From a paper:
A library of known aspartic protease inhibitors was screened to identify compounds that inhibit plasmepsin V from [name].
Modifications to the P1 biaryl region of the IPF scaffold differentially modulated inhibition of both plasmepsin V and X. Notably, analogs with potent plasmepsin X inhibitory activity successfully blocked the growth of Plasmodium falciparum in vitro.
Numbering used by the authors: 198 to 309, 316 to 536
Write the structure that this text describes.
Amino acid sequence: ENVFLIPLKHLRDSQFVGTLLVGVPPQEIHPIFDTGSTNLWVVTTDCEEESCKKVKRYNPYKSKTFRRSFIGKNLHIVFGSGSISGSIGKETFVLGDHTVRNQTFGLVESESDNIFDYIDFEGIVGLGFPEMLSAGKVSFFDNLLSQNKNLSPQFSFYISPEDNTSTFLVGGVSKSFYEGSIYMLPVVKEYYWEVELDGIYVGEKKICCEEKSYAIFDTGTSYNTMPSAQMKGFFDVVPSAPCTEENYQEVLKNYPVIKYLFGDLVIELLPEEYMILNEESCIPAYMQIDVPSEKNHAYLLGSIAFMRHYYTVFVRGAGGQPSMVGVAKARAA
Ligand SMILES: *[C@@H]1O[C@H](CO)[C@@H](O)[C@H](O)[C@H]1NC(C)=O
């Protein structure tokens, strides 16, 4: 009932890419769905770099609906260990057989040791709030809702890379992806999907907090994060260890349980959820944001270290009501 599902493929490069149709006749791209940004980015045939040609570049000159901006524009965005640069235009998009017209987006013209030489990047569907927009005034999701008034203003993520059942849902939730009830956390500022965080314990060790702190739900980041000061204390109590696929469950049996405190809601992260196997070793799926950015004082919750265990729901606040993030135990299989 007004809730369509977008299957998310888990690529070898740790990406969770969906499907997005651009232009008319439509051209298929496989972007990531990122609550950590808001711009809509598409890799285009204007980018002649090696990391671009390896993917199915969108050709704007073969689309009847492409509308380049009247004025030449250039947008440069940082994307991890790399950067994205390009122009601005409008296009018709189709997501899950739902159309969005007159949508502003960035045309990747350059991707210049580079993160793009390791992934098959084809674009970004930003799901953050409009204040983070630098390409356009109306966000893709808001524009999708306005042109499809039958949809409830919410989306959710089910992350299950084991059986390739990961799914991005628009318009609501489905009991087939979570167990129990959904706990709603109010968003403190409509910019990131950011909520209050009362504390963090690794076992009995207090990691957070000494200042009033916040968590950010960031589907575009695989690891969880902590500020640099707290990351040092985390790694002092959570070690890496030699691991194989045949003993990782034994190695991690008595690792510490991580507790995130959201008021009265206690969110547990188990060792097999925040630890990952990498090069014959169990390593924690945690990192600090060493690059100066707007997120370096928050606690990011990512796809691998959080969303594998918890079904996440994102509700856009209507009128004065604030937006909220919902969390529930994901259902296996
Ligand atoms: C898109 O813009 C055109 C003008 O170029 C306008 O005629 C049309 O109604 C717009 N469509 C939507 C869905 O806003």
